[PDB]
C-alpha cells in the first residue's frame, strides 16, 4: 500500500509563522510537524510515500527528509500549485498511486495513543472500501462529522455542518482502495471552493463501503491549526516524552522497530547526531537487546 502526506496549504491562521516556513515545518515540541504524520504511515507498514506541498515548500521537505533510504523507505515529492482541496491529493498522486490502495494523512494532524498501531495495521490490510477514523471533539462543526448507528455503521458524513449530527470528527487519516483516484476526479468544488475529502468519503458511503474506526477518549488527536493549538500540542508531546524514556515520532527509531533498517544502519544514522540528545537516543536504542 502506498501513502500520501498532504503537506501544503496557506497556513493563513498561523501568520506570520507561515510567511517563510511551511506550517508543516514548524515545531511540534522538538520535531518538525511533518515527522508526526510520516511516523503514522511508517507505523502502518507503509514504505512508499508521496509528500505533496506548495511550489515553494516542496523542496524544503525534500531537504529535510530526502528520498527515504536512511529510513529504509521511499519518499517522493510532488507540487500542488494551489490549495484547492484534500481530494487533489489523489489527482496529483495518480501516477504515484498506480493500481494500488493508498492512505492519506494530513500534514497538520497529530495522532497518539495506545492501541494505535493495531488499528493502523488493520486499516492498511483492508483491501476494499474506505476507512476513516472518528474522534469525539468539543466543536464538531469545525470538522467533517460522522454519524454512526449502534453497530458502528455509518449513517451520514458532512463537512463542517452547522447542526452536527454527532460529536465525532472525521480525523485526517484515511485509507482507500484504488477506486479513490476515479472518485476524486469526479467530485466538484464545495462552497469553500475545495475538492473535499468529505465528498470522496460520501462516494464510498453511497456504495455502503465507508467504514469508521472509533478512536476512543483515551486517544489524543490534536491539530496545529492555530497558534494556541500548536503550542498546546507541543506541550502535550513534551509531557509524554519527559516522563518516559521513549520518544514520539522518532523516524529513525520507527524505521528500526518496523525492520525497515538494521541495527548497523541505525548506528550509522546515530553517529553524525551524537553531538545531540537525539543521536544519543538513537545510539542507545541500537545497542539495546
Ligand atoms: C485544503 C488543503 C489542505 N492542505 C493541508 C494543510 C494541512 O496540513 C491540512 C489542512 O486540513 O491539509 C493541503 O496541503 N492542500 C490543500 O488543498
Ligand atoms: C513503537 C512506536 C510507537 N509510536 C507511537 C504510536 C502510538 O501513537 C503510540 C503507541 O504505540 O506510540 C511511536 O511514535 N514510535 C514508536 O517507535
Ligand atoms: O482543517 P480543515 O482543512 O478545515 O478540515 C480538514 O481536516 C479535518 C481534519 O483535520 C477534517 O475533519 C475535515 O474533514 C477536512 O476537510
- How many CA atoms are closer than 13 Å to the CA of 75, on its beta-carbon side? 25
DSSP state of 140: G
Per CATH, is 1-289 categorized as 3.40.640.10?
Answer: no
Please name the residues in contact with 114: beta carbons below 8 A apart, sequence gap of 6 or more: 218, 219
- How many CA atoms are closer than 13 Å to the CA of 224, on its beta-carbon side? 32
- The CA–CA distances, whole Å, from 55 to 22, 78, 80 equal 11, 9, 7
CA distance 27 to 55: 21
Write down the experimental method used for this entry: X-ray
Please name the residues in contact with 273: beta carbons below 8 A apart, sequence gap of 6 or more: 279, 280, 282
Instruction: Kindly report each contact of residues 265-273 with a partner whose C-beta sits within 8 Å and lies 24 or more positions away, as own/partner.
Output: 265/70, 265/72, 269/70
Cβ atoms of 62 and 141 within 8 Å: the answer is no
Centre of ligand 2 to C-alpha 92, Å, is 30
Is 88 close to ligand 3, i.e. is its CB under 6 Å away?
no
CA distance 102 to 180: 8
Is 176 close to ligand 2, i.e. is its CB under 6 Å away?
no
Tell me which residue has its CA closest to atom 14 in ligand 1. Answer: 8
Cβ atoms of 117 and 45 within 8 Å: the answer is no
The H or E element spanning position 49 is strand 48-53
Beta bridge partners of 52: 6, 78
> Which residue reads 511533518 in cell numbers?
34
> What does the block give as the cell for 12?
493563513
- In a 3-state reduction of DSSP, which class is residue 225? coil
Residue 187's CB: how many other CB atoms inside 10 A? 18
Cβ atoms of 113 and 219 within 8 Å: the answer is yes
> What does the block give as the cell for 59?
523542496
Which atom of ligand 2 has the smallest separation from the CA of 249?
Answer: 14
Beta bridge partners of 213: 133
Cβ atoms of 235 and 243 within 8 Å: the answer is no
Q: Give the resolution in Å.
A: 1.6
> What does the block give as the cell for 22?
511551511
Beta bridge partners of 145: 158, 169
> What does the block give as the cell for 35?
515527522
* Sign of the alpha-carbon torsion through 28, 33, 38, 41: positive
CA distance 205 to 228: 35
Residue 8's CB: how many other CB atoms inside 10 A? 29
- How many CA atoms are closer than 13 Å to the CA of 64, on its beta-carbon side? 19
The H or E element spanning position 171 is strand 168-176
CA distance 94 to 181: 6
Nearest C-alpha neighbor of 96 from the set 136, 49, 133: 49
Cβ atoms of 51 and 92 within 8 Å: the answer is no
In the chain the first and final C-alpha atoms are separated, in Å, by: 31
Binding-site positions read 8, 10-13, 23, 80, 83, 85, 108-109, 113-117, 144, 159-160, 170, 192, 249, 253
CA angle in degrees (0–180, nearest 5) for 134-140-141: 135
Nearest C-alpha neighbor of 109 from the set 21, 231, 3, 230: 230
DSSP H helices, 93-148, are: 94-97, 116-124
Q: Which residues line ligand 1 (CB under 6 A)?
A: 6-9, 24, 80, 83-86, 88, 106-108, 194
What's the burial of 231, exposed, middle or buried (CB within 10 Å: 0-12/13-18/19+)? middle
Which atom of ligand 1 has the smallest separation from the CA of 194?
Answer: 1
CA distance 51 to 186: 23
Instruction: Sketch the domain layout of the chain as residue ranges.
Output: 1-289
DSSP state of 106: E
Amino acid at each position: 500500500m502506498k501513502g500520501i502526506i498532504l503537506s501544503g496549504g496557506s497556513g493563513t491562521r498561523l501568520y506570520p509563522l507561515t510567511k517563510v516556513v511551511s506550517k508543516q515545518l514548524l515545531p511540534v515540541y522538538d520535531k518538525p510537524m511533518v515527522y508526526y504524520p510520516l511516523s503514522v504511515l511508517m507505523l502502518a507498514g507503509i514504505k512508499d510515500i508521496l509528500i505533496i506541498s506548495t511550489p515553494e515548500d516542496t523542496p524544503r521537505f525534500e531537504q529535510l527528509l530526502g528520498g527515504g533510504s536512511e529510513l529504509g523507505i521511499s519518499l517522493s515529492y510532488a507540487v500542488q500549485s494551489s490549495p484547492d482541496g484534500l481530494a487533489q491529493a489523489f489527482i496529483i498522486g495518480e501516477e504515484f498511486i498506480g493500481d494500488d490502495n493508498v492512505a492519506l494523512v494530513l500534514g497538520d494532524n497529530i495522532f497518539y495513543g495506545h492501541g494505535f498501531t493495531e488499528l493502523l495495521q488493520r486499516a492498511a490490510n483492508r483491501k476494499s472500501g474506505a476507512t476513516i477514523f472518528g474522534y469525539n471533539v468539543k466543536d464538531p462543526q469545525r470538522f467533517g462529522v460522522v454519524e454512526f448507528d449502534e453497530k458502528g455503521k455509518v449513517i451520514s458524513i458532512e463537512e463542517k455542518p452547522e447542526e452536527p449530527k454527532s460529536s465525532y470528527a472525521v480525523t485526517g487519516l484515511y485509507f482507500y482502495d484504488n477506486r479513490v483516484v476515479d472518485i476524486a476526479k469526479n467530485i466538484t468544488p464545495s462552497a469553500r471552493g475545495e475538492l473535499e475529502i468529505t465528498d470522496v468519503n460520501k462516494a464510498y458511503l453511497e456504495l455502503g463501503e465507508l467504514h469508521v474506526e472509533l478512536l476512543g477518549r483515551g486517544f489524543a488527536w490534536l491539530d496545529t491549526g492555530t497558534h494556541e493549538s500548536l503550542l498546546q500540542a507541543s506541550q502535550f508531546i513534551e509531557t509524554i516524552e519527559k516522563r518516559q524514556s521513549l520518544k514520539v515520532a522518532c523516524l529513525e527509531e520507527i524505521a528500526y522497530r518496523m525492520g525497515y533498517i538494521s541495527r548497523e544502519q541505525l548506528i550509522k544514522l546515530a553517529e553524525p547526531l551524537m553531538k545531540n540528545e537525539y543521536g544519543q537516543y538513537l545510539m542507545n536504542l541500537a545497542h539495546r537487546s
